[PDB]
Scaffold this active site. Structure first.
Site, mmCIF file in Angstrom:
data_model
loop_
_atom_site.group_PDB
_atom_site.id
_atom_site.type_symbol
_atom_site.label_atom_id
_atom_site.label_comp_id
_atom_site.label_asym_id
_atom_site.label_seq_id
_atom_site.Cartn_x
_atom_site.Cartn_y
_atom_site.Cartn_z
ATOM 1 N N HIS A 1 6.154 -2.555 -9.573
ATOM 2 C CA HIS A 1 6.922 -3.263 -8.346
ATOM 3 C C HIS A 1 6.671 -4.681 -8.021
ATOM 4 O O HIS A 1 5.477 -4.987 -8.277
ATOM 5 C CB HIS A 1 6.242 -2.412 -7.357
ATOM 6 C CG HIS A 1 6.452 -0.840 -7.088
ATOM 7 N ND1 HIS A 1 7.327 -0.454 -6.143
ATOM 8 C CD2 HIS A 1 5.957 0.023 -7.956
ATOM 9 C CE1 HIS A 1 7.299 1.011 -6.457
ATOM 10 N NE2 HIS A 1 6.387 1.158 -7.523
ATOM 11 N N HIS B 1 0.809 6.476 3.266
ATOM 12 C CA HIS B 1 1.807 7.118 4.069
ATOM 13 C C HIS B 1 1.538 7.278 5.643
ATOM 14 O O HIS B 1 2.010 7.992 6.380
ATOM 15 C CB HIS B 1 2.060 8.455 3.400
ATOM 16 C CG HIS B 1 2.807 8.652 2.160
ATOM 17 N ND1 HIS B 1 3.783 9.523 2.142
ATOM 18 C CD2 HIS B 1 2.489 7.853 1.217
ATOM 19 C CE1 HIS B 1 4.267 9.280 0.931
ATOM 20 N NE2 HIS B 1 3.609 8.188 0.185
ATOM 21 N N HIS C 1 11.746 8.983 -9.323
ATOM 22 C CA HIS C 1 10.622 9.362 -8.449
ATOM 23 C C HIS C 1 11.581 10.318 -7.611
ATOM 24 O O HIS C 1 12.264 10.185 -6.549
ATOM 25 C CB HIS C 1 10.048 8.341 -7.909
ATOM 26 C CG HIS C 1 9.193 8.583 -6.763
ATOM 27 N ND1 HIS C 1 8.000 7.880 -6.490
ATOM 28 C CD2 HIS C 1 9.307 9.608 -5.759
ATOM 29 C CE1 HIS C 1 7.443 8.495 -5.398
ATOM 30 N NE2 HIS C 1 8.135 9.355 -4.838
ATOM 31 N N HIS D 1 14.632 6.808 -6.069
ATOM 32 C CA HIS D 1 13.485 7.107 -5.481
ATOM 33 C C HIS D 1 13.610 7.876 -4.238
ATOM 34 O O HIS D 1 14.603 7.588 -3.466
ATOM 35 C CB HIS D 1 12.774 5.697 -4.910
ATOM 36 C CG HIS D 1 11.252 5.739 -4.704
ATOM 37 N ND1 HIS D 1 10.858 6.311 -3.454
ATOM 38 C CD2 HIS D 1 10.112 5.338 -5.460
ATOM 39 C CE1 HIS D 1 9.585 6.376 -3.485
ATOM 40 N NE2 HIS D 1 9.129 5.599 -4.442
ATOM 41 N N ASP E 1 12.182 7.718 -1.427
ATOM 42 C CA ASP E 1 12.130 6.927 -0.218
ATOM 43 C C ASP E 1 13.785 6.517 0.231
ATOM 44 O O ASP E 1 13.943 6.013 1.541
ATOM 45 C CB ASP E 1 11.267 5.959 -0.088
ATOM 46 C CG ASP E 1 9.787 6.353 -0.262
ATOM 47 O OD1 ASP E 1 9.621 7.441 -0.126
ATOM 48 O OD2 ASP E 1 9.010 5.352 0.140
ATOM 49 N N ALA F 1 7.533 0.279 -1.843
ATOM 50 C CA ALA F 1 7.575 1.715 -2.119
ATOM 51 C C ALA F 1 8.108 2.064 -3.335
ATOM 52 O O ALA F 1 8.016 2.824 -3.963
ATOM 53 C CB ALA F 1 8.099 2.345 -0.932
ATOM 54 N N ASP G 1 2.676 1.209 -12.177
ATOM 55 C CA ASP G 1 2.844 1.492 -10.895
ATOM 56 C C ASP G 1 2.400 0.285 -10.297
ATOM 57 O O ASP G 1 2.083 0.621 -8.889
ATOM 58 C CB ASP G 1 2.788 2.899 -10.230
ATOM 59 C CG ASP G 1 3.435 3.206 -9.309
ATOM 60 O OD1 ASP G 1 4.469 2.587 -8.692
ATOM 61 O OD2 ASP G 1 3.067 4.369 -8.395
ATOM 62 N N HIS H 1 5.665 8.645 -13.244
ATOM 63 C CA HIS H 1 4.616 9.403 -12.569
ATOM 64 C C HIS H 1 4.771 10.743 -12.765
ATOM 65 O O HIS H 1 4.753 11.577 -11.657
ATOM 66 C CB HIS H 1 4.143 8.911 -11.337
ATOM 67 C CG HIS H 1 5.266 8.698 -10.416
ATOM 68 N ND1 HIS H 1 5.928 9.496 -9.971
ATOM 69 C CD2 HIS H 1 5.328 7.410 -9.762
ATOM 70 C CE1 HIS H 1 6.771 8.908 -9.057
ATOM 71 N NE2 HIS H 1 6.444 7.697 -8.879
ATOM 72 N N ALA I 1 2.184 -0.418 -5.924
ATOM 73 C CA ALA I 1 2.711 0.669 -4.930
ATOM 74 C C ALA I 1 1.733 1.855 -5.043
ATOM 75 O O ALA I 1 1.454 2.368 -4.016
ATOM 76 C CB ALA I 1 4.139 0.991 -5.558
ATOM 77 N N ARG J 1 0.160 17.393 -2.871
ATOM 78 C CA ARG J 1 0.570 16.234 -3.601
ATOM 79 C C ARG J 1 -0.524 15.750 -4.588
ATOM 80 O O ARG J 1 -0.163 15.235 -5.797
ATOM 81 C CB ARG J 1 1.141 15.212 -2.947
ATOM 82 C CG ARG J 1 1.382 13.896 -3.855
ATOM 83 C CD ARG J 1 2.407 12.946 -3.259
ATOM 84 N NE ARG J 1 2.389 11.655 -3.581
ATOM 85 C CZ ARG J 1 3.206 10.684 -3.295
ATOM 86 N NH1 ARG J 1 4.048 10.727 -2.488
ATOM 87 N NH2 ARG J 1 3.177 9.424 -3.962
ATOM 88 N N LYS K 1 16.763 2.761 -10.434
ATOM 89 C CA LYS K 1 15.516 3.556 -9.901
ATOM 90 C C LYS K 1 16.173 4.321 -8.914
ATOM 91 O O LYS K 1 16.644 4.000 -7.949
ATOM 92 C CB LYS K 1 14.447 2.639 -9.635
ATOM 93 C CG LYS K 1 13.282 3.602 -8.824
ATOM 94 C CD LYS K 1 12.580 4.400 -9.596
ATOM 95 C CE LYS K 1 11.263 5.069 -8.959
ATOM 96 N NZ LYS K 1 10.354 4.011 -8.484
ATOM 97 N N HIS L 1 7.131 0.271 -15.179
ATOM 98 C CA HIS L 1 6.851 0.754 -13.794
ATOM 99 C C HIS L 1 6.203 -0.298 -12.805
ATOM 100 O O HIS L 1 5.103 -0.255 -12.538
ATOM 101 C CB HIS L 1 6.228 2.209 -13.860
ATOM 102 C CG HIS L 1 6.547 2.874 -12.245
ATOM 103 N ND1 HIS L 1 6.517 4.062 -12.206
ATOM 104 C CD2 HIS L 1 6.711 2.424 -11.026
ATOM 105 C CE1 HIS L 1 6.693 4.605 -11.095
ATOM 106 N NE2 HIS L 1 6.490 3.420 -10.210
HETATM 107 NI NI NI Z 1 7.197 6.341 -7.389
HETATM 108 NI NI NI Z 2 6.348 3.028 -8.314
#
Ligand code: NI
Ligand code: NI
Lengths: 570, 100, 122
Positions: A139, A323, A249, A222, A224, A170, A363, A275, A366, A339, A220, A137
């Site tokens: 970024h 965010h 995600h 995601h 977003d 992200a 992660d 995650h 990110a 969350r 991936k 994971h």
């Molecule tokens: Ni994520």
């Molecule tokens: Ni991530």
């Protein structure tokens, strides 16, 4: 003549029945077996065993069962066992685990572990040796993150990104054929194994598939980019044809569905749930229930690991910051509260301890820390021991069962999930020689030497101007494996089968070892080593309480952790 | 100044020691890197002062005591080594078991 | 209890080295004027010529001391050492070039040792 055990362990590292504390935790690992012949231990130095006509054979050429490298007297900690052995490397791969030396005069030498003229020696006596960590994971945001990862024993980075672009900041995505080609070329200069994920988004197959064919090693999905039923479905159809893994995600907002809708779109196909607790992202509040399913390979990211007294305050703020949530707009506060949940973070600790969450990951950059996947794994196992007691399966006073369950989460399990465990993820004969030596006092905190493809790539070492390498300042530094063209032979770029068959490496002029992603569509939770539990996880929509087998899973947050202020300057 | 590679690196030990000294002055039990930085800088500054390698091997054992450091730190530090320019050139100082 | 990071908790007992192999005690004298130190795994008959001992008793053997340690003989010092048997294929190559094959060829090893002045043949 006999040697007492204290003296034996000081000289050759521990032997059967001896225990070693992991850093400053309360976890103890015990040597299960030892491949040596007492009295014929290999060691190197003035007047020592590995000398010509003695422990070093003077007769055989390199091809005749002679090693390129012998790690003497290693205490291996791996999913396969916790045991003492010499490790022999040749052609950049682990070729022997057993007993090295010279069959002329020593008993019990493994036949292809001859120390000869061609052999380099690394003394591992008194060290714990593990596989390099497999972080799935990642970024790709800041190239400075690689050294951070190497320093904490990570040797493979799977993920995506093009640097500090918002998509990459992200999501673990390198989108489309051109960005993938660019990042494959960048990868030629990164001293770590890499696999790149394309964008797992689209409603037609071709836009998604062309990323695979361009050299991506997985996808991936995601939220977003729209974690919709269509993007999920198309990505899994591509993955099943291409034999690559899909990470997800999911839709935190529950915009196009709730968890059961994302599971219906998955439709029993294999997927890696990133995650899985959900602070890092996913259907609120119940995404963690994915970890109960047979077709899900579940991983945690590291900021929630383990649950501590500053975790919630840090995450609520972190989420707001990232965010751009105002503490003013009721919707933003309600979103954040839905969350970041102590109830699921506390249960996450326990799900790791039970073998229901199979993997750890970072992660990196990110919402996770590139150099803390290994660290936090052990902090979690230590917290669990204190709060839940030694698992029922242990034996002496040892924490071996827990240690194998937890080492698996950042070594072999991520490798199996990503379809690269034929090459990396464990200390086994026939796998790439990505090995991490640790002093026990620093175990899981700061690696001593990180071997990549059989050459040391990164080490904690001192003054380059000194008479010897130990004088201060001792700091993490890149070694000869990262220099010149050696960076190409010591690291692997993992790629889809189709991109390899289509000649992408040659097209792009890639010089690195090329690794093939394979066998990741025909696996499930049952294939996660020591972490293969399937069960019905219930997350109460009102209270967020997690139940497994009718029992609430809850534990307290801790005020202090081992592997923390005793070691770090900041 | 004509800084060479070692001089640049060794500046960072002095800085870490200054950081550590401030932490000790406000009452903190020091951790592993703090303790190593304090002792290391003391050795390098002692060399600059013109002390002998033998004086520093002795003095380095009395810079920090167990009550100055966190539990386990004394046992984590088996020795501290530093090279510095004495009046007679660069020499290596090794302080064995600096904190009892 | 007090935590020493990375500490061992060794099991009870002792480790016997070179178990099951014949042991032999011999007297060895350093007739030279400089110190001689002998590692655990050097074929004993092939040590420094100025070490005086019954060379035949060094054939196919090595010091029965912990792997990686050595025995020291100051100038003029005579002391007893304990030898153990070599294992594996019981072949020695190189070193002083006295064996280059099986250690069973005692007559050939001794002939070479004597011709080259390794003290104590016969
Ligand atoms: Ni994520
Ligand atoms: Ni991530």
């Amino acid at each position: 003549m006999k040697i007492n055990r204290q003296q034996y362990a000081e000289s050759y590292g521990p032997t059967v029945g001896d225990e070693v504390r992991l850093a400053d935790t309360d976890l103890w690992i015990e040597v299960e077996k030892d491949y040596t012949t007492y009295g014929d231990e290999v060691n190197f130095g003035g007047g020592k065993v590995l000398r010509e006509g003695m422990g070093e054979n003077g007769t055989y050429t390199r091809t005749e069962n002679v090693l390129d490298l012998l790690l003497t007297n290693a205490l291996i900690l791996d999913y396969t066992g916790i045991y003492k052995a010499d490790i022999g490397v040749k052609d950049g791969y682990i070729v022997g685990i057993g007993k090295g030396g010279n069959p002329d005069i020593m008993d019990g030498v493994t036949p292809n572990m001859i120390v000869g003229t061609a052999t380099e020696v690394i003394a591992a006596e008194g060290k714990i040796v593990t596989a390099g960590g497999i972080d799935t994971h990642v970024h790709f945001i800041n190239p400075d993150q690689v050294d951070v990862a190497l320093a904490n024993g990570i040797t493979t980075l799977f993920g995506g990104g093009t640097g500090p672009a918002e998509g990459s900041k992200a999501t673990t995505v390198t989108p489309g054929p051109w960005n993938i080609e660019k990042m494959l070329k960048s990868t030629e200069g990164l001293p770590i194994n890499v696999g790149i994920l394309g964008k797992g988004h689209g409603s037609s197959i071709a836009p998604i598939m062309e990323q695979i064919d361009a050299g991506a090693a997985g996808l991936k999905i995601h939220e977003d980019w729209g974690a919709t039923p269509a993007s999920i479905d198309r990505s899994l159809t591509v993955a099943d044809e291409a034999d690559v893994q899909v990470a997800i995600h999911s839709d935190t907002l529950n915009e196009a569905g709730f968890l059961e809708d994302t599971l219906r779109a998955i439709n029993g196909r294999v997927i890696h749930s990133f995650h899985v607790e959900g602070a890092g992202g996913g259907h609120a509040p119940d995404i963690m229930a994915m970890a109960g399913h047979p077709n899900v390979l579940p991983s945690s990211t590291n900021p929630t690991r383990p649950f501590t007294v500053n975790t919630i305050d840090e995450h609520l703020d972190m989420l707001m910051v990232c965010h751009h949530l105002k503490q003013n707009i009721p919707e933003d506060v309600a979103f954040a509260d839905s969350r970041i949940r102590p109830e699921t973070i506390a249960a996450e600790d326990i799900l790791h301890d039970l073998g229901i969450i199979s993997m750890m990951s970072t992660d990196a950059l990110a919402m996770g820390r590139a150099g803390e996947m290994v660290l936090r794994t052990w902090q979690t196992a230590d917290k669990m021991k204190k709060q839940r007691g030694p698992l029922a399966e242990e034996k002496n006073g040892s924490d071996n069962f827990r240690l194998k369950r937890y080492v698996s989460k950042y070594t072999i399990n991520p490798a199996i999930a990503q379809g690269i465990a034929h090459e990396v993820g464990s200390i086994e004969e026939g796998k790439f020689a990505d090995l991490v030596l640790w002093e026990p006092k620093f175990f899981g905190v700061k690696a001593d030497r990180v071997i990549k493809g059989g050459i040391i790539a990164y080490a904690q070492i001192g003054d380059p101007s000194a008479s010897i390498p130990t004088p201060q300042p001792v700091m993490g530094r890149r070694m000869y494996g990262t220099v010149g063209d050696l960076i190409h032979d010591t690291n692997i770029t993992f790629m889809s089968k189709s991109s390899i068959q289509q000649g992408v490496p040659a097209k792009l002029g890639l010089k690195r070892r090329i690794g093939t992603v394979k066998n990741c569509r025909n696996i499930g939770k049952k294939d996660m080593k020591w972490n293969d539990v399937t069960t019905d996880i219930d997350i109460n929509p009102e209270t967020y309480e997690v139940k497994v087998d009718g029992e609430v899973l809850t534990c307290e947050p801790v005020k202090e952790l081992p592997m923390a202020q005793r070691y770090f300057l900041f | 100044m004509h800084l060479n590679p070692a001089e640049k690196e060794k500046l960072q030990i002095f800085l870490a020691s200054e950081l550590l000294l401030r932490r000790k002055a406000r009452g903190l039990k020091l951790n592993y890197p703090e303790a190593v930085a304090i002792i290391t800088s003391f050795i390098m500054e002692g060399a600059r002062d013109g002390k002998t390698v033998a004086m520093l091997m002795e003095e380095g054992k009395h810079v920090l005591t167990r009550d100055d450091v966190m539990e386990g730190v004394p046992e984590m530090i088996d020795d501290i080594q530093a090279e510095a320019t004495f009046p007679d050139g660069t020499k290596l100082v090794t302080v064995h078991n600096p904190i009892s | 209890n007090y935590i020493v990071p990375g500490e061992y908790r060794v099991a009870e007992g002792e480790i016997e080295i070179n178990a099951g192999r014949e042991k032999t005690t011999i007297r060895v004298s350093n007739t030279g004027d400089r110190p001689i130190q002998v590692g655990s795994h050097i074929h004993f008959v092939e040590v420094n010529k100025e070490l005086l001992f019954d060379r035949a008793e060094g054939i196919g053997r090595r010091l029965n001391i912990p792997s990686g340690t050595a025995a020291r003989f100051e100038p003029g010092e005579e002391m007893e050492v304990e030898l153990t048997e070599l294992g594996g294929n019981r072949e020695v190559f190189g070193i002083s070039d006295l064996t280059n094959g099986s250690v069973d060829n005692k007559e050939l090893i001794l002939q070479r040792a004597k011709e080259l002045g390794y003290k104590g043949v016969e």
